[PDB]
Ligand binder design. Structure first.
Ligand SMILES: CCCCCCCC/C=C\CCCCCCCCCCCCCC(=O)O
Length: 133
């Protein structure tokens, strides 16, 4: 069910990421650096466990989870959140909750590209990733 998401992916387009980061309270200097960063995202499975790595010079993250089972997460911007990742409509939907707030990270495949839609508050960011061979 998750298999077309698996592999190594490179950021090739970003829309409204500054809006999204600002909504989360990320400071201006961090937003500068992030606006010029192109992460690599690696999604792997081993049985029922998925591991999602996000790699960049000034920040790396890694999470492991089972679909549909809540996990604790500490995000790149140091929020301590309660997370769950599920498939919905063929999309990989990651929901983070903290302090009564929520954000969603939705991944879908369109024409072989991985489209990541990030929503917090009213801010909606769309990041496009291309698969590495
Ligand atoms: C690893 C996060 C994405 C790249 C960040 C580059 C800038 C690093 C500079 C300082 C460290 C703190 C950065 C925090 C940035 C905002 C994070 C917001 C939540 C995660 C967004 C993931 C986006 C993606 O998956 O494409």
């Amino acid at each position: 069910m998750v298999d077309a998401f698996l592999g190594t992916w490179k950021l090739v387009d970003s829309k409204n990421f500054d809006d999204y980061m600002k909504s989360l309270g990320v400071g201006f200097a961090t937003r500068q650096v992030a606006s010029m960063t192109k992460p690599t995202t690696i999604i792997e499975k081993n049985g029922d466990i998925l591991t999602l790595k996000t790699h960049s010079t000034f920040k790396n993250t890694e999470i492991s989870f089972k679909l549909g089972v809540e996990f604790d997460e500490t995000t790149a911007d140091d929020r301590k959140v309660k997370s769950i990742v599920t498939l919905d409509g063929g999309k990989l939907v990651h929901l983070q909750k903290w302090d009564g707030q929520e954000t969603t990270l939705v991944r879908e495949l369109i024409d072989g590209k991985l489209i990541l839609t990030l929503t917090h508050g009213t801010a909606v960011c769309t990041r496009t990733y291309e698969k590495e061979a």
